[PDB]
Design a protein around this motif. Structure first.
Motif, PDB file in Angstrom:
ATOM      1  N   UNK C   1       0.848  -1.188   0.000  1.00 26.09           N
ATOM      2  CA  UNK C   1       0.000   0.000   0.000  1.00 26.09           C
ATOM      3  C   UNK C   1       0.885   1.239   0.000  1.00 26.09           C
ATOM      4  N   UNK C   2       0.563   2.197  -0.867  1.00 23.76           N
ATOM      5  CA  UNK C   2       1.300   3.451  -0.956  1.00 23.76           C
ATOM      6  C   UNK C   2       0.655   4.586  -0.171  1.00 23.76           C
ATOM      7  N   UNK C   3      -0.661   4.753  -0.275  1.00 18.83           N
ATOM      8  CA  UNK C   3      -1.345   5.861   0.380  1.00 18.83           C
ATOM      9  C   UNK C   3      -2.822   5.525   0.523  1.00 18.83           C
ATOM     10  N   UNK C   4      -3.523   6.371   1.272  1.00 17.44           N
ATOM     11  CA  UNK C   4      -4.975   6.333   1.387  1.00 17.44           C
ATOM     12  C   UNK C   4      -5.512   7.595   0.727  1.00 17.44           C
ATOM     13  N   UNK C   5      -6.325   7.422  -0.313  1.00 17.35           N
ATOM     14  CA  UNK C   5      -6.783   8.549  -1.117  1.00 17.35           C
ATOM     15  C   UNK C   5      -8.094   9.136  -0.602  1.00 17.35           C
ATOM     16  N   UNK C   6      -9.117   8.305  -0.423  1.00 16.47           N
ATOM     17  CA  UNK C   6     -10.416   8.799   0.026  1.00 16.47           C
ATOM     18  C   UNK C   6     -11.117   7.704   0.817  1.00 16.47           C
ATOM     19  N   UNK C   7     -11.269   7.921   2.115  1.00 16.23           N
ATOM     20  CA  UNK C   7     -12.170   7.103   2.914  1.00 16.23           C
ATOM     21  C   UNK C   7     -13.583   7.654   2.763  1.00 16.23           C
ATOM     22  N   UNK C  20     -11.427   0.972   5.553  1.00 12.31           N
ATOM     23  CA  UNK C  20     -12.748   0.366   5.655  1.00 12.31           C
ATOM     24  C   UNK C  20     -13.242  -0.008   4.261  1.00 12.31           C
ATOM     25  N   UNK C  21     -14.433  -0.597   4.210  1.00  9.73           N
ATOM     26  CA  UNK C  21     -15.016  -1.012   2.942  1.00  9.73           C
ATOM     27  C   UNK C  21     -15.361   0.206   2.093  1.00  9.73           C
ATOM     28  N   UNK C  22     -14.930   0.188   0.835  1.00  7.63           N
ATOM     29  CA  UNK C  22     -15.132   1.300  -0.065  1.00  7.63           C
ATOM     30  C   UNK C  22     -14.045   2.351  -0.049  1.00  7.63           C
ATOM     31  N   UNK C  49     -11.110  -0.810  -1.668  1.00 11.63           N
ATOM     32  CA  UNK C  49     -11.218  -1.898  -0.704  1.00 11.63           C
ATOM     33  C   UNK C  49     -12.640  -2.439  -0.716  1.00 11.63           C
ATOM     34  N   UNK C  50     -12.770  -3.753  -0.892  1.00  9.65           N
ATOM     35  CA  UNK C  50     -14.066  -4.386  -1.102  1.00  9.65           C
ATOM     36  C   UNK C  50     -14.476  -5.330   0.023  1.00  9.65           C
ATOM     37  N   UNK C  51     -13.803  -5.299   1.169  1.00  3.14           N
ATOM     38  CA  UNK C  51     -14.172  -6.165   2.282  1.00  3.14           C
ATOM     39  C   UNK C  51     -14.060  -5.367   3.576  1.00  3.14           C
ATOM     40  N   UNK C  58      -7.880  -9.235   6.879  1.00  3.82           N
ATOM     41  CA  UNK C  58      -7.062  -8.964   5.705  1.00  3.82           C
ATOM     42  C   UNK C  58      -7.755  -7.923   4.840  1.00  3.82           C
ATOM     43  N   UNK C  59      -6.984  -7.309   3.949  1.00  5.50           N
ATOM     44  CA  UNK C  59      -7.475  -6.255   3.069  1.00  5.50           C
ATOM     45  C   UNK C  59      -7.550  -6.811   1.652  1.00  5.50           C
ATOM     46  N   UNK C  60      -8.751  -6.799   1.082  1.00  7.15           N
ATOM     47  CA  UNK C  60      -8.989  -7.176  -0.304  1.00  7.15           C
ATOM     48  C   UNK C  60      -9.446  -5.953  -1.082  1.00  7.15           C
ATOM     49  N   UNK C  61      -8.904  -5.775  -2.282  1.00  5.28           N
ATOM     50  CA  UNK C  61      -9.203  -4.596  -3.080  1.00  5.28           C
ATOM     51  C   UNK C  61      -9.326  -4.979  -4.546  1.00  5.28           C
ATOM     52  N   UNK C  62     -10.028  -4.133  -5.292  1.00  3.95           N
ATOM     53  CA  UNK C  62     -10.166  -4.261  -6.738  1.00  3.95           C
ATOM     54  C   UNK C  62      -9.439  -3.092  -7.386  1.00  3.95           C
ATOM     55  N   UNK C  63      -8.528  -3.401  -8.307  1.00  8.14           N
ATOM     56  CA  UNK C  63      -7.763  -2.368  -8.995  1.00  8.14           C
ATOM     57  C   UNK C  63      -8.653  -1.635  -9.992  1.00  8.14           C
ATOM     58  N   UNK C  64      -8.603  -0.303  -9.973  1.00  9.03           N
ATOM     59  CA  UNK C  64      -9.471   0.515 -10.817  1.00  9.03           C
ATOM     60  C   UNK C  64      -8.773   0.744 -12.150  1.00  9.03           C
ATOM     61  N   UNK C  65      -9.034  -0.143 -13.103  1.00 15.86           N
ATOM     62  CA  UNK C  65      -8.483  -0.004 -14.445  1.00 15.86           C
ATOM     63  C   UNK C  65      -9.570   0.464 -15.403  1.00 15.86           C
TER      64      UNK C  65
END
Lengths: 268, 171, 65, 194, 504, 270
Positions: C1-7, C20-22, C49-51, C58-65
RNA sequence: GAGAACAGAAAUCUCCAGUAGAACAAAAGGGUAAAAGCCCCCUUGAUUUUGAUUUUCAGUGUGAAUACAAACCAUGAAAGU
RNA sequence: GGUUGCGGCCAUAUCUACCAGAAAGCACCGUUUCCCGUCCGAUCAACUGUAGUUAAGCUGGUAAGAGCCUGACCGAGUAGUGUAGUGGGUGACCAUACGCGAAACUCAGGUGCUGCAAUCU
């Protein structure tokens, strides 16, 4: 309206200034020789040049307001007024302005032993590339008048400022040489202005890295007699030589930046 | 000079103008009948000013026109001259060798009448020039025409006498 | 993880770094082998982050391509 | 095969940022006067030597190469090798003075006194709960002007009893908005005067 | 974008300080040198004293005069043993670093080079459409660089005119994906092996199909190789060797359109087949073995090489460039007679084959056990060398056209350069961020091009062992890349259904 | 009825703007504007079309008037084998290919400057397309000449949405249509269409092909042979001059009107 | 300035002359004419995101504003803007 | 010397009326299937140089035409303009030495110079 705002933003002051523009103003009395010399200088200066065509009643050593108005209207910090008189024949007055106000003025007279650009009839360089400079004379480092001449000509013909240079653009050299070293109490020797184009040849003694250079003159060849001077006030000098320092990183003791870009502190 | 074939006066363009004045259904029907007449869609002209007496607002539709060039223009012109029974005034031509006239009813042109069509009048105008008039029109080297080469009123009258053999009445 | 952009809950949680989720985070994608149209190697992108890591560890995420 | 090693008594100086070379050697008036026909040859030889020295310095300067192809932004392709010119040494006067630091406005002083941090300004899109769309909070088709387009406005209870009851509430709110904008403009003009 | 750290104040002052001029001293004394051949280990002239200001060209002319071939010189490259090449002159190469003093001797290893030069490809000529699916294989014509064959996943091959970057011929005989394409070394016929277990032959000039498809393989074709021109007797056409997934290698006579031999020794799928210059065939297969068959002995397997612990993905021969080029050269000249073509092909092959005493045909096998093996099958049966260091499977391996270098492209996003004679490690090419699929040399063995999974091609300079130029432009994965014989064009193809042409 | 005050206050444009053949708004951006500030010289590939000739010139701007580096004309095409259609799309492509090959041969790029001291390899020759006063339209002969030069081997930056066959719906081209226009398939199709539809029209149009007995299916062959010959030998051979400079000068001044002296004019007035 | 039914001092079309006397901003003593004026096409992203760099703030010190630069983005055949 | 393409200086090059231009080039001119754009193939786009013409474009000569431009040892170092020796003058102002410095007028004159490449009966 947006275009006018963009023009105002371009005109306003900034930390990294643009290339200085030069405006060529005919005076009350002008000659074909004056027009040809002005055309040659404007060709050496372009595309940072504007040229007026009509006649203007300008007396720089008697009034500065029309020159200041022209500078403020045209956003040109360099002025070249071409005039003629019986006492001063073929007079060129170079006015460098600071903040739309007169910073300094020099007044030179062009000698008759001159040849125009079209006299030589030689192949010249590409339009709009910065030249090389050569200055010959210890008065460029000692005498205030020749100091002013050197600074004025460097500022006039320097052009775009860059830190990366293509070797295919090193075309021509401008030489300013003092006609013999002088002594105090003597008349100021004339300054000789020459323009040469470079031809590189294989050297056979500098390897394949250092070619032999030769110069072919392309003109104009000019002799400037130093007629009149006008020097700035020291506070104006300091204000014009102030530096922005916004861009550069502040220096701090015992703090360095290594090759990887990590900030490092030293311990004693 | 006159023997040279390049000095012939020909039909440059025939412009048919219908100025309905009041925008709407009558303008649409005028455009439709001009389309059915010339075989081509017309072009509308926007309003230029606002006059209460003229009843025209700012930037509305006032007139339609059709520009026809070639043998179709020749056929339309000969039908119009048949309607006009081959007689034009000396004032019908202009100082630039171009001439026009008005037709009150288009039913006489041969168009079958329809009640939905109604009745429309139209202004014919014909432009005359010699070959070589594209010098003023081309993008590159746009230049003026020669003084002697320019189309003139009496030359157009002579051409009309040669072509259609119709007397140009003084009054 | 590099940074947190928007919670998505709050900018205060964004600056505190709450996952958190989203939550939109920035991730290092160097091993994904992404190249721009101009030849630049991409090594950082956004993911969501999707969970709930508080729930499943654990942290699960979907890459925004 | 002419030499490329110009030897000079007085060592010359260089300003490679301005591409200039300065030599302060001894110049004779006789060889440079207009009465001499060899003045052109003398000046050409001197300038040739100085140009040779300057070219030696420039071609001994460090060089930058790249691997990007043509047709991309930057101007330097793989085949081009560019000299890295140092910063210019000679000082020249500016054309305009440095931009002065603007004095703090009344809002800035108040925000400093009360500890108000600047807004994050992420974007101009706000979510509309009454619909299912994101809308601009101001500007073209902004959400600050939806009351003008609102089909039905209830009349406030406090307006009754005054002569401003007959006025359209949309007109009243547009007037209040324009008054606020003109107040902001007057405050800006006041700050510029101060 | 991540930028490099900027220069500091002290560094700016150092830059503004005056620079030093690399000048040749006039008082440079003579240096005692001894020549030595890299290939043969032979010395010419012994200890000879040469001036300190000697140029590379003057040294080359002096060496030609020493050898006695001044009338017809051959340019050489010089190195000194660390081993450092002679770039411009001896003083700036060795004495200026100070490693070797003037009083000491200099042992100059000289190596022959190519007369001509290939300019690096720096830009994309065009993006040509026409293929309806992903591009699977591509090749250039040997005689000219204006003809390219490209087989794709739309069951078709295409012949492209590279001069105008436009399609020329469509070849739509196959039923399934066209897995491999090949051009005859005399330039007469294109052979395509497809996924429908068939092989087809095409006349390129007419864009036509010669007879019916070649059938008999029960699985899809994996690789096609041609019989070399210098071994083909004049008046006859070369035979075609084909491998397939079923584990058999079939030999086809195209004159009579028959199958002569069907070798079947491999227990698993055959990865590749190569028809060497000494009348042998080399087959690599997923049974971790390499089989050397004799064509002259009714297709009897001469040798079985067993040293790999995984599938051998690829194999390459030292003379592969000459085998593919036949009699043609970079000038595109065509011999008048078949006898002349065979003689010129023999000379070109011998230029690489017979050198430093005895002719040898080295082989290199790149396998899925992350390694390669370097073999000399004629003299010994044990492997001559083992090349290790790749952290993932080696997908491609290529001998340089002169045979003095080996290049291995692996799935660990890297390329490796090894010596061609002993197999020792030289250098690593890095810069790809995805797995490298395949590689291709230039004609003068100075430039290399590689295609990768990261949608990029990269041209590397072998002499300086660095990245020369980076070529993006493909919107998806690149599967095939090839460099023309004359070194003027590079073709690339992949998932984007576009043929990219690259030139200088 | 123009006034003398109007005559005095009139402000004429430049000479080339008066006799309109130069767009100075385009020229200033072509000559004096640079993407980078590295002082790299620029070159223009000027393409012009007359009613019967095509002019392609590689020009470098210069403070004393610009200088031509290389040039090619469509009247050199009969030398390579093009005797018909010297002003079409195929002729433009051949002229661009010819000027590209000629410039490359002159520079030695494809079979002592100051750059060779710093860089090991010569740069590809980059030029910028100059079209003057022409309309940028899809399927134009100037873009055909640009394609010819690009295939010849000059680096001319360009997109491909102006070549024939470019579809306006999807950002894609039809290379089959492009190759047809390259090798004159439109001319051959018009030839066949006229021969099938109107023999009277085909009597006038394509008369030279009938006179030389050149078939409609041989246009591709002759264009290909012309391309091969141009690539084989692109050097410039000037036309032989039957007469000399003084001969032409005397013969022209025989017809030119002689100046009358001021004293003769005064005598004529008096 | 002349020609064209309604249609004249004002509607709309056609031709010639037309240094800008029009329309845009500033208060030129030289602003803009194959435009900086009018129409058409493409973009709705313009409050992008990266920074060991400039200035300010923080008990949440690798965050945000802020200045500058770069990578992008838009358009154009391109030069380029 | 004519002409073409790209230009530099931007009226000695501009506007109005006559006359000439052999050869080449340029232009007018011919066709609308293809690419492309309009109400109109008029403009723009494509094709043939095929059917013709120098009638225009363009160049050159002419006019006590208008306009414009150039040298003056031409006004003239003149008008004007800032200091000054204690120059006078209780007075509105006056010659002088050092500096800066015009235009109107008059004479003599003019209607393009040129760089690069190609081509010409």
């Amino acid at each position: 309206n947006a275009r006018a705002k963009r023009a105002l933003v371009k005109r306003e002051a900034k930390l990294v200034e643009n290339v200085k523009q030069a405006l060529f103003i005919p005076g009350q009395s002008c000659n074909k020789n004056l027009h040809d010399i002005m055309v040659d200088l404007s060709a050496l200066k372009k595309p940072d040049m504007k040229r007026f065509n009509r006649k203007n009643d300008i007396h720089p050593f008697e009034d500065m307001s029309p020159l200041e108005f022209f500078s403020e209207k045209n956003d040109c910090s360099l002025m070249v007024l071409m005039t003629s008189s019986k006492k001063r024949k073929n007079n060129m007055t170079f006015i460098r302005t600071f903040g739309y106000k007169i910073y300094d003025m020099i007044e030179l007279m062009v000698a008759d032993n001159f040849k125009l650009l079209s006299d030589f009839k030689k192949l010249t360089f590409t339009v709009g590339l910065k030249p090389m400079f050569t200055f010959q004379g210890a008065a460029f480092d000692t005498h205030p008048v020749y100091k002013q001449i050197k600074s004025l000509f460097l500022d006039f013909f320097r052009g775009e400022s860059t830190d990366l240079q293509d070797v295919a653009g090193l075309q021509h050299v401008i030489s300013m040489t003092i006609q013999g070293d002088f002594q105090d109490g003597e008349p100021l020797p004339n300054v000789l202005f020459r323009v040469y184009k470079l031809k590189s040849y294989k050297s056979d003694q500098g390897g394949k890295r250092l070619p032999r250079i030769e110069l072919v003159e392309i003109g104009p060849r000019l002799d400037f007699k130093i007629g009149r001077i006008h020097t700035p006030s020291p506070d104006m000098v300091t204000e014009a030589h102030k530096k922005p320092k916004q861009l550069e990183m502040k220096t701090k003791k015992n703090v360095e930046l290594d090759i990887m870009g990590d900030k490092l502190g030293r311990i004693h | 000079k006159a023997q040279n074939p390049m000095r012939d006066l020909k039909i440059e363009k025939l412009v048919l103008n219908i100025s309905v004045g009041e925008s709407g259904d009558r303008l649409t029907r005028a455009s439709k009948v001009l389309e059915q007449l010339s075989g081509q869609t017309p072009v509308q002209s926007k309003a230029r000013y606002t006059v209460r007496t003229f009843g025209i607002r700012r930037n509305e539709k006032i007139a339609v026109h059709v520009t026809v060039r070639g043998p179709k223009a020749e056929e339309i012109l000969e039908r119009g001259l048949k309607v006009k029974e081959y007689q034009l005034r000396d004032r019908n031509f202009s100082a630039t060798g171009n001439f026009g006239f008005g037709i009150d009813e288009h039913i006489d042109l041969g168009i079958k009448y329809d009640p939905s069509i109604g009745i429309f009048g139209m202004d014919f105008y014909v432009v005359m020039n010699r070959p070589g008039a594209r010098v003023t029109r081309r993008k590159r080297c746009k230049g003026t025409v020669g003084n002697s080469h320019k189309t003139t009123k009496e030359d157009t009258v002579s051409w009309f006498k040669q072509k259609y053999d119709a007397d140009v009445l003084d009054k | 993880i590099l940074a947190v952009k928007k919670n998505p809950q709050s900018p205060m949680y964004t600056q505190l770094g709450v996952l958190t989720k989203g939550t939109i985070i920035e991730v290092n994608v160097s091993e994904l082998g992404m190249v721009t149209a101009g030849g630049k190697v991409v090594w950082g992108k956004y993911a969501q982050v999707t969970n709930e890591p508080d729930r499943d560890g654990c942290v699960n995420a979907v890459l925004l391509v | 095969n002419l030499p490329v090693t110009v030897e000079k008594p007085i060592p010359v100086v260089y300003d490679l940022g301005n591409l200039a070379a300065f030599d302060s050697n001894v110049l004779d008036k006789n060889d440079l006067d207009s009465s001499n026909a060899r003045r052109e040859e003398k000046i050409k030889s001197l300038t040739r030597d100085n140009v040779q020295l300057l070219i030696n310095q420039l071609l001994s300067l460090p060089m930058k190469t790249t691997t990007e192809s043509v047709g991309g932004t930057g101007g330097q392709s793989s085949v081009m090798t560019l000299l890295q010119l140092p910063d210019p040494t000679t000082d020249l006067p500016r054309e305009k003075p440095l931009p002065k630091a603007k004095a703090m406005t009344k809002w800035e002083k108040f925000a400093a006194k009360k500890g108000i941090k600047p807004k994050e300004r992420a974007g101009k899109m706000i979510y509309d709960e009454a619909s299912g769309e994101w809308v601009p909070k101001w500007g073209y088709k902004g959400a600050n002007k939806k009351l003008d387009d609102q089909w039905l406005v209830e009349v406030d209870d406090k307006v009754k009893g005054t002569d401003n009851e007959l006025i359209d509430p949309r007109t009243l709110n547009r007037a209040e908005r324009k008054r606020l904008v003109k107040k902001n403009e007057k405050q800006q003009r006041r700050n510029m005067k101060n | 974008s991540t930028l490099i750290p900027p220069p500091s104040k002290k560094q700016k002052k150092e830059a503004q300080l005056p620079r030093e001029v690399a000048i040749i001293p006039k008082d440079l004394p003579n240096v005692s040198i001894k020549f030595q051949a890299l290939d043969t280990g032979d010395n010419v002239g012994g200890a000879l004293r040469v001036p300190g200001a000697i140029s590379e060209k003057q040294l080359e002319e002096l060496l030609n005069q020493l050898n006695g071939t001044s009338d017809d010189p051959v340019p050489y490259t010089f190195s000194c043993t660390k081993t450092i090449d002679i770039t411009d002159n001896l003083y700036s190469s060795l004495i200026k670093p100070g490693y070797n003093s003037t009083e000491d001797q200099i042992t100059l290893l000289y190596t022959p080079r190519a007369v001509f030069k290939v300019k690096p490809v720096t830009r994309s000529s065009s993006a040509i459409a026409g293929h309806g699916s992903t591009i699977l294989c591509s090749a250039f014509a040997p005689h000219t660089s204006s003809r390219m064959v490209t087989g794709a996943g739309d069951n078709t091959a295409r012949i492209w005119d590279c001069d105008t970057q436009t399609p020329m011929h469509t070849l739509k005989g196959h039923y399934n994906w066209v897995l491999c394409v090949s051009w005859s070394p005399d330039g007469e016929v294109i052979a395509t092996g497809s996924m429908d277990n068939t092989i087809r032959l095409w006349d390129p000039k007419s864009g036509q199909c010669l007879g019916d498809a070649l059938r008999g393989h029960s699985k899809w074709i994996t690789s096609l190789s041609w019989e070399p021109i210098h071994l083909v007797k004049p008046g006859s056409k070369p035979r075609l060797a084909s491998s397939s997934k079923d584990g058999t290698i079939k030999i086809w006579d195209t004159v009579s359109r028959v199958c002569q031999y069907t070798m079947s020794g491999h227990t698993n799928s055959v990865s590749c087949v190569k028809w060497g210059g000494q009348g042998l065939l080399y087959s690599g297969s997923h049974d971790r073995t390499v089989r050397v068959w004799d064509i002259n002995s009714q297709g009897r397997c001469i040798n079985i090489l067993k040293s790999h612990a995984h599938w051998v993905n690829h194999l390459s021969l030292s003379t592969d460039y000459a085998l593919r080029i036949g009699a043609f050269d970079h000038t595109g000249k065509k011999p008048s007679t078949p006898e002349e073509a065979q003689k010129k092909a023999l000379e070109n092959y011998e230029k690489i084959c017979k050198k430093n005493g005895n002719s040898e045909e080295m082989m290199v096998t790149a396998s899925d056990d992350y390694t390669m093996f370097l073999w000399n099958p004629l003299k010994s049966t044990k492997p001559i060398a083992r090349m290790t260091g790749h952290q993932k499977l080696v997908n491609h391996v290529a001998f340089s056209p002169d045979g003095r270098y080996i290049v291995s492209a692996s799935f660990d996003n890297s390329i490796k350069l090894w010596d061609g004679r002993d197999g020792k490690f030289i250098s690593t090419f890095r810069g790809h961020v995805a797995s490298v699929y395949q590689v291709a040399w230039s004609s003068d063995c100075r430039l290399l091009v590689s295609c990768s999974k990261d949608t990029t091609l990269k041209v590397w300079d072998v002499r300086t062992r660095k990245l020369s130029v980076d070529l993006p432009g493909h919107k998806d994965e690149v599967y095939t890349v090839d460099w023309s014989v004359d070194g003027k064009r590079v073709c690339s193809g992949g998932k984007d259904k576009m043929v990219r042409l690259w030139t200088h | 009825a123009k006034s003398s005050a109007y005559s005095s206050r009139f402000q004429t444009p430049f000479r080339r703007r008066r006799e309109g053949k130069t767009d100075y708004y385009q020229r200033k951006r072509l000559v004096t504007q640079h993407k980078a500030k590295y002082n790299t010289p620029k070159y223009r590939l000027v393409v012009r079309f007359t009613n019967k000739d095509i002019i392609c010139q590689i020009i470098s701007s210069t403070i004393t008037g610009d200088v031509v580096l290389a040039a090619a004309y469509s009247h050199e095409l009969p030398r390579y084998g093009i005797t018909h259609g010297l002003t079409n799309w195929a002729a433009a492509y051949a002229t661009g290919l010819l000027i590209a090959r000629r410039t490359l041969q002159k520079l030695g790029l494809d079979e002592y400057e100051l750059t060779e001291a710093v860089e090991d390899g010569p740069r590809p020759f980059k030029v910028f397309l100059d079209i003057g006063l022409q309309r940028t339209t899809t399927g134009a002969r100037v873009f055909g000449a640009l394609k010819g030069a690009s295939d010849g081997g000059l680096y001319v930056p360009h997109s491909e949405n102006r070549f024939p066959g470019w579809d306006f719906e999807t950002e894609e081209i039809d290379p089959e249509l492009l190759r047809s226009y390259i090798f004159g398939g439109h001319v051959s199709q018009y030839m066949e269409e006229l021969a099938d539809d109107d023999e009277e029209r085909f009597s006038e149009l394509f008369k030279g092909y009938l006179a030389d007995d050149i078939d409609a299916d041989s246009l591709e062959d002759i264009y290909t042979s012309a391309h091969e010959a141009i690539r084989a030998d692109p050097a410039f051979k000037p036309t032989e001059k039957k007469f000399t400079k003084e001969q032409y000068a005397a013969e022209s001044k025989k017809y030119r009107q002689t100046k009358l002296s001021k004293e003769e004019r005064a005598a004529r007035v008096a």
